[PDB]
Coordinates of C-alpha atoms in Angstrom, one line a residue:
Chain A
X12 CA 46.4 33.9 -9.7
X13 CA 43.7 34.5 -12.3
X14 CA 44.1 31.0 -13.6
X15 CA 44.1 29.5 -10.1
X16 CA 41.1 31.6 -9.3
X17 CA 39.1 30.2 -12.1
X18 CA 40.2 26.7 -11.2
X19 CA 40.1 26.5 -7.4
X20 CA 37.6 29.2 -6.3
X21 CA 33.8 29.3 -6.4
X22 CA 31.8 32.1 -7.7
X23 CA 29.3 32.4 -4.9
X24 CA 26.5 33.7 -7.2
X25 CA 26.5 30.2 -8.6
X26 CA 26.9 28.5 -5.2
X27 CA 23.8 30.2 -3.7
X28 CA 21.8 29.1 -6.7
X29 CA 22.9 25.6 -6.0
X30 CA 22.0 26.0 -2.4
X31 CA 18.5 27.4 -3.0
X32 CA 18.0 24.5 -5.4
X33 CA 19.2 21.8 -3.0
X34 CA 17.2 23.2 0.0
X35 CA 14.1 23.2 -2.1
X36 CA 14.8 19.6 -3.1
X37 CA 15.2 18.6 0.5
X38 CA 12.2 20.4 2.0
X39 CA 10.3 19.0 -0.9
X40 CA 11.4 15.4 -0.5
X41 CA 10.6 15.6 3.2
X42 CA 7.2 16.9 2.6
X43 CA 6.7 14.3 -0.1
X44 CA 7.5 11.5 2.3
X45 CA 4.8 13.0 4.6
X46 CA 2.5 11.7 1.9
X47 CA 4.2 8.6 0.7
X48 CA 4.2 7.2 4.2
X49 CA 0.5 8.0 4.5
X50 CA -0.7 6.4 1.2
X51 CA -0.5 2.9 2.9
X52 CA -2.9 4.3 5.5
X53 CA -5.5 4.3 2.7
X54 CA -5.4 0.5 3.1
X55 CA -7.1 0.1 6.4
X56 CA -9.8 2.4 5.4
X57 CA -10.7 -0.5 3.1
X58 CA -12.0 -3.7 4.8
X59 CA -9.7 -2.8 7.6
Chain B
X24 CA 13.0 -4.1 -5.2
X25 CA 10.4 -3.6 -7.9
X26 CA 10.8 -7.2 -9.0
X27 CA 10.7 -8.5 -5.5
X28 CA 7.7 -6.3 -4.9
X29 CA 5.8 -7.9 -7.7
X30 CA 6.8 -11.4 -6.6
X31 CA 6.6 -11.4 -2.8
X32 CA 4.1 -8.7 -1.9
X33 CA 0.3 -8.6 -2.2
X34 CA -1.7 -5.8 -3.7
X35 CA -4.3 -5.5 -1.1
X36 CA -7.0 -4.3 -3.4
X37 CA -6.9 -7.8 -4.8
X38 CA -6.7 -9.4 -1.3
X39 CA -9.8 -7.6 0.0
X40 CA -11.8 -8.8 -3.0
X41 CA -10.6 -12.4 -2.1
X42 CA -11.7 -11.8 1.5
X43 CA -15.1 -10.5 0.6
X44 CA -15.6 -13.5 -1.7
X45 CA -14.5 -16.0 0.9
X46 CA -16.5 -14.5 3.7
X47 CA -19.6 -14.6 1.5
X48 CA -18.9 -18.2 0.7
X49 CA -18.6 -19.1 4.4
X50 CA -21.6 -17.2 5.6
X51 CA -23.5 -18.7 2.7
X52 CA -22.3 -22.3 3.3
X53 CA -23.3 -22.0 7.0
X54 CA -26.7 -20.7 6.1
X55 CA -27.0 -23.5 3.5
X56 CA -26.3 -26.2 6.1
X57 CA -29.1 -24.6 8.2
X58 CA -31.3 -26.0 5.4
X59 CA -29.5 -29.2 4.4
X60 CA -29.7 -30.4 8.0
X61 CA -33.4 -29.6 8.1
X62 CA -34.4 -31.3 4.9
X63 CA -34.3 -34.7 6.7
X64 CA -36.9 -33.3 9.1
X65 CA -39.4 -33.4 6.2
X66 CA -39.2 -37.2 6.7
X67 CA -41.0 -37.5 10.0
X68 CA -43.7 -35.2 8.8
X69 CA -44.5 -38.2 6.6
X70 CA -45.8 -41.4 8.3
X71 CA -43.7 -40.3 11.2

């Protein structure tokens, strides 16, 4: 059961770190696309 | 998509330069013809 524990289980102190990371990466990427999809709006400020 | 971007797209900062150029060339050429079509009117100021 020790062996199967180290194989099959997850230590949640690691998991929650992975979660915090991934959540930051998503909220980031979303907020990034808020800008990437607005950089083409600099176009029609020029000559329109 | 990078490759197809550099092939098929236009960088608009180049385009708008081409536009400004062409517009100047048209407005110019028009205003030029305002004179070229009036140089023959110097004729009938002479002997009529």
